[PDB]
């Protein structure tokens, strides 16, 4: 009768991961609620048996389940989001945007109102209070599948009212505990890519909501080498692509230019159009209270799979400069650059634009 | 006709990353040739529906496609090795055996039969040659995909006939590419666990070939907790577990002494018993020829989803002793310690034990 006080909300969303959440957060005794979030209206439906794995493990470790939609929120929020980057020529992280402001705002104020203390979700991620009582985001001890990366946007107040149960698991773990609690999502495969497209090819999704406009592909030296099927289909450093057969080595998307919808291509995975020394950054949001104006000598990641690297930061409030100690590869706008300190996760930004020797790269 | 000079024999396990494999060096230019191992006899099998994928792809990508048999290989080199592992109180690593010994012994022999000049697989790493002619190993550049790890083994002479061509790719490019090539296995789920037990239950798996002895549970302090089910169902570090229901607070595998049958547990992600200063480790292998004895400073991995981490290692031929820069948790006999010099992967051994001050740590 402990923790039997204190009521944790967790995000259930069918897979694995907060199936393992709820039951973990269960046995320590929690007063615990599943909470089913449909976000997105993808009919023939992916919803209803997910809905279902929800309801069969929470009646396998007898929890309440509800069920709550926030399409609107979503659509507003993260879709629109989503797409506006792609019609600015940026290439977006929509999970960032929805950690932001789905599940950790529309899900967090819902929560409240079921009388939560604490909302969970299955990231893998960590919590750490101080002495002050203030909370840091610290990397999953999983390093493959550490989500800090897509929850850079949280703030202290977000952060006082989240745990993280997976935190110090290691996926597979999360799977040997699954099957010895006989979770009927135990071998439940996760589903990849954006939740909204799914298993839908990527290509016919956002041509439902964007026109594509097929432009030039040049290389670097002015050479057309044909056409591209719209710049949406293309993010900066890609090897290959849509039309992207061009000797027999690949080829690299190596920048893009909106205003005159060309596609620049050439050889090789270090091409020199590819390589950045530093990038500016919006949105630029710190898990805690920081000056208006200051320095950080630290790591960032400028995308989700690579290990972090030496960075120096300058704040000033709208806008953020960082500087890499080591040249960069495919410094891609929209994109968020996320700041650590060893192992905890700082904050983060959006890429705006990237830079070499004083003039912003042709990623556009 | 460059590349078309060179044979590459790709391993083609039915998955995206093998298709992804074969359809890159087909599209390069290289004479490619699909082969499909069967190592494992499962029947009701598992190994019928994917070589029906290997068709699919390479019929789709227009390569040749055939099909070998190592069942025996796998049973004598892998297997025993796993069961052998088990009885000795350790946890074993099959794939780094299976790489090897298999992937790139067995499969390489056979493939050279073939007038194969390169294996190629959809392992996550590079293979850079020197001015010299001398390949190293890098880390992939999906650092949560990098499989250097399990890969610690191969010899120079392996590498040598070596190329992994995903190893500049993140894994949702690799589906991209697939997708965009309309493979039929690009929307196909990844096998989780090793590849033999499958999505079988892996207690009834192992009890089916070593005989299971539930014995006492027990806290450090002597403090009888129950029984276990047998200790090659638990390992160092793990929470929870069969029986480990024990305070509201998870109670964590601690330790273990198998001439006792004794598992050790108790609570606390940090328990002292959980944390080491040095390790032993054997069959220590370096991708390159290195002196009889040497010391080296770098960084190990010693479980394959962490970061890294500064370590002494002095190496004398059949024993090799890591001193850690900082104490570490659950360092745990029979599992890979991985050494890296920055992006290159030096080599590997297997911890045999574990030491804090001077005193070998009751893992067994
Ligand atoms: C798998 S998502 C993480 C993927 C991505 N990196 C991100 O941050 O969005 C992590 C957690 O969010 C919560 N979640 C995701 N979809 C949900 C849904 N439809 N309803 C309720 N919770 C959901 C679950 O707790 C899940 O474990
Ligand atoms: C997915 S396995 C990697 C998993 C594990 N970390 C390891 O090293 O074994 C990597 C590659 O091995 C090869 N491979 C695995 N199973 C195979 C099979 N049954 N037949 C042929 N090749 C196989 C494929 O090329 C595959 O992409
Ligand atoms: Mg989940
Ligand atoms: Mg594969």
Known sequence: ???????????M?????????????????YDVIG????????????????????????????????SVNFEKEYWDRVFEYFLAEYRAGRTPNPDVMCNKEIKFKAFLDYAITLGADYVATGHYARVA??????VHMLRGVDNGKDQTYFLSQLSQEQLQKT?????????????????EAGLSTAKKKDSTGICFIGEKNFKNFLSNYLPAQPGRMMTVDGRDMGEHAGLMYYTIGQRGGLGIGGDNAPWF???????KNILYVGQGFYHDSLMSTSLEASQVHFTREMPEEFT???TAKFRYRQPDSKVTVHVKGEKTEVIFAEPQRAITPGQAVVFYDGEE????????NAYRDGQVCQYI
């Not at 149960?165 to 799977?175: I, Q, Y």
């Open 253 to 259: 998307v190596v920048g893009k230019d909106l205003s």
């Open 129 to 134: 209070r101080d002495e002050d009582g203030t």
């Open 35 to 66: 909470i089913f979030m449909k976000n997105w209206d993808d009919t023939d439906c992916t919803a209803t048996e997910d809905y279902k794995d929800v309801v069969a493990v929470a009646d396998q470790i007898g929890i309440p389940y509800y």
């Open 163 to 179: 745990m993280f149960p997976l935190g110090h698991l290691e996926k597979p773990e999360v799977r040997r505990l699954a099957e």
């Open 345 to 352: 996760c700082l904050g983060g930004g959006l890429i705006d």
């Open 1 to 11: 009768s402990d923790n039997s006080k204190t009521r944790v909300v967790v995000g």
């Open 296 to 298: 950080l000598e630290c």
């Open 13 to 29: 969303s069918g897979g694995v991961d907060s199936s393992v959440t709820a039951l973990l957060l269960k046995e320590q005794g």
